[PDB]
Ligand binder design. Structure first.
Ligand SMILES: C[C@@H](NC(=O)c1cc(-c2ccccc2)nn1C)c1ccc(C(=O)O)cc1
Ligand SMILES: C[C@@H](NC(=O)c1cc(-c2ccccc2)nn1C)c1ccc(C(=O)O)cc1
Lengths: 297, 302
């Protein structure tokens, strides 16, 4: 019957909810007390990352039935406390697919040509031709680990660069991935073939440290790695060791095991390109997530 | 043609092809004007990349010189007037770097759309400025491609995979031909108002010097993003700075400048400008291809 939008949402969110017969209250940056007070007669709550849906908030909101996040990450929602009260938690990973795939492709191009490091060099007044000699993507092999929507979108874009796209996903059939030009091979056969590796999986026990000391050792010397999915899929200590030896020639990281990362060794490495988790940070993705969460309600 | 001096750092295939063709080869780097002239006294050929300046003084002091080859596109570092006066043939590799230049152009478009260089600098400064960044999704946006030769065509087909609408103009390439590689041509005046991003891929001619100027920037959509990986001066540098200062241009990516290295720092230093030190052809692959293409030409002459 009534939904509280507690973060900054595109007006489309409220209008879809209102067209569906729901009463909508839109407020921003409420204190814990104001949040609890607004939620008393709300069965629904829509957030982005700013609102903290803690155990204290859920337990004080007796009429609450669903917490909806317009985006991917639900670190601001207490999943345990929501499940403790029988509350369902919804999100919109689909709304962020295109923007995350586009950033991943940008990162691949940045690893081949070191555009971020070359800009920093130019801004320091330097003209370093030899230092930034790079590589051509045409004809190189891209290994895509995770063949859901984001992996598929990365594949079709990088195929236009003449990259050979191979990969693996234990959920996606070889017939489905063949339909978008991705040949699946057993995971052990992927490592030695790749010039570039990108990860597009959820973070689970089976995907934690997918890239680790053992799998980096199976890679071609000078592999370049991208993680625009979730911090922890690439083991950060193993990645630093691989960068230190040259086993990994460069890495691009939008995500970290700890955000912001307190260990700065990866961010500070000359062959590491990084962003502060910008995969979903476009007006288009934010508007799409807002629409998708209101449709779900 | 019996002896060839390679005076810049080239791919090792260049020396090997010349030698397999029966030519003696001397490989040197970073020679002074005096050292270069001294090395050339018994050479009928010279192969350069870009650092060696084949000036009138060098040409006139190299009596035995018959041919000057550049392992790259254009001949900026060769005095064509002085070579023609001395009956010296000038050879180069016009298509040796096409894919590498198109790939850099696409990387610059992505970097402008998501402020990747600025984000990396922020992280390296120990900051987490997520709330200060707002990127643009490319799908559905319009990319204007001015110049539809090999490089513009290669940029087009790559950016089409991102769902960008690729429009453009070229007075040589017909609208029917560009349609075959997915670029919709319209009169040049109709291109400016439609673009979210503009990239230039023309030669540098009197007609393309300042193609983007105060007049044409005013015809663009407010917040246009511009890329120049082609030739310094196609985008008027003063007009670009004025457009960045007003917000008429939201960002620019430059691989090339009217002066290299640029001594005027206004553009490079701008917060919304990303840049490279002329890296368009700087890949192992493009260098290998240019080195091969120039050496095969010298052996063909023999
Ligand atoms: C399609 C599905 N794939 C998976 O879940 C998956 C892949 C892998 C995997 C392990 C090792 C190597 C390679 C791959 N292990 N798992 C469970 C999926 C992908 C992305 C999302 C998302 O972006 O939210 C959601 C679902
Ligand atoms: C195909 C041919 N186009 C041209 O020469 C050209 C384009 C344009 C032009 C003027 C205004 C707006 C838009 C375009 N004016 N001219 C003569 C070509 C392109 C690139 C190269 C190269 O990369 O060196 C070589 C040749």
């Amino acid at each position: 019957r009534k939904v509280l939008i507690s973060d900054s949402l595109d007006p489309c969110c409220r209008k879809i909810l209102q067209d569906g017969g729901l009463q909508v209250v839109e407020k921003q940056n409420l204190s814990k007390e104001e949040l609890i007070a607004e939620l008393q007669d709300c069965e629904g709550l829509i957030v982005r990352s700013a609102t903290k849906v803690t155990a204290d908030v859920i337990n004080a909101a007796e009429k609450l039935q669903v917490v909806g996040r317009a985006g991917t990450g639900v670190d601001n929602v207490d999943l345990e406390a929501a499940t403790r009260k029988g509350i369902l938690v919804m999100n919109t990973p689909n709304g962020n697919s295109l923007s995350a795939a586009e950033l991943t492709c940008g990162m691949i191009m940045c690893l081949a040509r070191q555009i971020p490091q070359a800009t920093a060099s130019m801004k320091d007044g330097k003209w370093e031709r030899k230092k930034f000699m790079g590589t051509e993507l045409n004809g190189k092999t891209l290994g895509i680990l995770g063949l859901g929507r984001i992996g598929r979108e990365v594949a079709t874009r990088m195929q236009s660069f003449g990259m050979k796209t191979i990969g693996y996903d234990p959920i996606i059939s070889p017939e489905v991935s063949a339909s978008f030009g991705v040949q699946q091979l057993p995971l052990e056969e992927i490592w030695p073939l790749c010039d570039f590796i990108t990860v597009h999986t959820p973070l689970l026990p089976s995907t934690t440290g997918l890239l680790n000391d053992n799998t980096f050792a199976q890679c071609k010397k000078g592999v370049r790695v991208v993680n625009c999915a979730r911090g922890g899929i690439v083991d950060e200590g193993a990645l630093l060791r691989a960068l230190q030896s040259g086993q990994c020639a460069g890495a691009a990281l939008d995500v970290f095991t700890e955000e912001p990362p307190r260990d700065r060794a990866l961010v500070d490495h000359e062959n590491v390109i990084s962003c502060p988790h910008l995969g979903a940070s476009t007006k288009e993705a934010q508007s799409r997530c807002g629409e998708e969460i209101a449709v779900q309600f």
